[PDB]
Each structure stands twice: as structure tokens, then as C-alpha cells.
Amino acid sequence: DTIQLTAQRKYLAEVQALETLLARELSVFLTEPGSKKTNIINRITGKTYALPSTELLRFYEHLEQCRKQGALMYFLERQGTYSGLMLDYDLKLNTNAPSLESSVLSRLCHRIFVHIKNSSVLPEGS
Amino acid sequence: HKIHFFFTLKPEAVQGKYGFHVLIPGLKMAASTKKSIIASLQHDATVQKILHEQGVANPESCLDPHSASVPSLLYGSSKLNHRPYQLKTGFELVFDSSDPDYIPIHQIKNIESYNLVSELSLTNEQGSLVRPVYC
């Protein structure tokens, strides 16, 4: 796996820019493990950071630039008590081969919103 | 079932008098049932308050009750020295009487590639997109 990391790192300008930014500018935002300032986890280098919004925008832009070329990454983030909502559905297919039609996704999205309304208090308004 | 809505709009308001039409060829009901529907829409406050900011002086008196009786002009036709109504857009709705959870109102794509006169005919039953929903 490390040969792949070397290949993309050395042989793709986007990953070069990403790592140069991380090493030169974003190193001053490093955090000791377990600190509540941790917002980003690099599961490769095992380093946690504390980036404010102003460099968060440039970090996200660079990260997207890497993604557009299919560059390999495992950059995670630590979610606290107050954040967006995330769902994971590890389905177990009885057969080795689904369609997941758009209308089906609309049905599930509406059902999710119904459950959110019933099981939570939403802000009033539009 | 599939229920289609169409919105034909007047090319321009003349002497501060505007008009637009809603065509639902899919539904098929008796004349009295249409009279009941249009009577229920006449006093609907929702449409009226929607039209309050639309520069509509009297949104209440805008719906002509005679719509279920007076013969309708085919799409593209018009009246003496009058310009035909133009189809601004056409909506499509999917209704499941088995279990209503949410009506998926979307827009009909490629409405221009279709025989609009054939599709929008009220008495037509062979429409490629409009389908007969027998009530």
C-alpha cells in the first residue's frame, strides 16, 4: 500500500500541493491525541489537527482537487455532540448481485424526514 | 395512478385583465362532480392569499363556474381577434390511493417533443403521455 502512496504522492501535483500545505502551513495547528480541539484525523500519519474555518476552506478545496483525480486518501474528521446527521446501512445481499432507483431514494428520503419530524423538534419556519 | 397538470398562460394581460388555464385531461368524472370540485375551489383561501401578492384585485372571483359546461377550445385555437393561450409549463403528479405519504410533483420533461394538441385534448383517450384515469 505504501508503494501506492509513494506513487500518488510523488507523481501527482495535487497530492504534492496537499502534503506541502499540510507540512508547512497546517503543522502549527497540530493537536496532541485526545484533545477536544481535534477536528481532522489523518488515519495514515496518525496526526490530529485543529483548523479554523479560514484555512478549513483551503483545506477542503485542496482535498477536492485531489479527489477529482481519484487520488487515494483516508482523511477523517471528529464529530462532536452538535454536528450534521450521518447514516450507515450495511446491507446483507442474499444474492451475490441492487438497482436503488431514484424514486426509491425519494421514498426513503421522505420516510427519513417523517421520522425526523416525529422523533425530534425542528425549528419553526421555512 | 399518474395525473398530469398543464398551465397555459395568456401571452399578455390586456387592460389589466390576465388569465391562465389549468388542463387536467387525465381525470374523468361526471359534470356534477366537476361542479362540486369547482364549487369547493371557489372559496379556497389558500389560492386567494397566494394571489393576493400576485396583483390580483379579487382572487375570490377569478374562477368561472361555467368551466365544467362550456365547450373548451383546442390547444392552439383562439377567439376572433384573440391570441391563443401558450403552455407555460406542464406538471406531472403520481397518486397512490393504496397509501398516500407524499405527492411527488415534478415537471414533465421534453413536453415540446409531443403532439400537444393530441395530448391536451379533454376527450382524448390515446394520449402518449396523458393516460385515462377513470373516476
Side-chain angles (χ1 to χ4, degrees), chain A residues 1-10 12-29 31-39 41-42 44-46 48-50 52-54 56 59-75 77-84 86-95 97-107 109 111-119 121-126, chain B residues 1-11 13-14 16-22 24-34 36-37 39-41 44-47 50-51 53-57 59 62 64-69 71-77 80-94 96-101 103-106 109-111 113-114 116-118 120-123 125-129 131-135:
Chain A
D1 54 352
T2 176
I3 72 170
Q4 275 305 293
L5 290 175
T6 311
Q8 286 97 27
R9 164 159 40 73
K10 180 67 173 66
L12 259 188
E14 296 86 341
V15 190
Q16 209 55 21
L18 174 65
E19 69 179 2
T20 49
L21 270 294
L22 263 67
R24 294 311 161 121
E25 322 295 333
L26 311 192
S27 59
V28 308
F29 305 98
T31 61
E32 61 86 20
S35 176
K36 299 295 113 179
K37 264 67 60 180
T38 287
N39 77 312
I41 294 92
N42 193 321
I44 291 299
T45 78
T48 67
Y49 298 76
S53 297
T54 182
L56 194 66
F59 170 53
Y60 286 165
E61 198 289 325
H62 273 65
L63 204 143
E64 169 68 17
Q65 274 301 324
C66 295
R67 182 199 70 85
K68 291 177 79 70
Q69 302 324 309
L72 187 146
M73 73 204 163
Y74 191 176
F75 233 150
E77 51 79 22
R78 217 174 50 89
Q79 60 86 29
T81 178
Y82 201 66
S83 283
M86 172 86 217
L87 294 174
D88 290 337
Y89 292 97
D90 46 354
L91 323 177
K92 274 70 68 178
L93 300 188
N94 50 4
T95 66
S99 67
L100 274 291
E101 183 46 70
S102 288
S103 298
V104 176
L105 304 189
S106 181
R107 291 220 59 192
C109 180
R111 194 62 175 167
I112 297 169
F113 191 76
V114 166
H115 284 286
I116 292 168
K117 176 59 183 65
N118 298 350
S119 298
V121 172
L122 316 175
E124 181 80 24
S126 175
Chain B
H1 300 284
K2 193 73 68 66
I3 300 293
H4 295 100
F5 300 77
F6 308 95
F7 285 69
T8 78
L9 269 64
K10 194 180 287 183
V14 289
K17 216 53 63 184
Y18 192 78
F20 73 95
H21 298 344
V22 174
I24 303 164
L27 294 173
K28 294 282 155 159
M29 71 281 278
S32 58
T33 317
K34 301 181 203 189
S36 174
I37 290 162
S40 70
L41 275 307
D44 175 271
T46 305
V47 170
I50 287 162
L51 295 173
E53 72 274 16
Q54 278 309 293
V56 183
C62 283
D64 190 327
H66 312 301
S67 313
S69 49
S72 188
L73 61 85
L74 279 176
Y75 188 47
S77 296
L80 279 190
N81 296 115
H82 291 59
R83 295 179 67 188
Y85 277 90
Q86 154 63 29
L87 183 47
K88 189 268 183 181
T89 180
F91 286 166
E92 61 87 20
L93 193 148
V94 182
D96 180 50
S97 200
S98 87
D99 186 75
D101 52 0
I103 54 171
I105 282 162
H106 251 88
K109 308 327 182 183
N110 290 318
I111 198 67
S113 74
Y114 291 150
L116 286 192
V117 178
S118 189
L120 269 71
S121 177
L122 297 200
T123 66
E125 301 284 273
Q126 275 49 54
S128 176
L129 264 73
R131 282 314 179 168
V133 173
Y134 302 113
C135 312

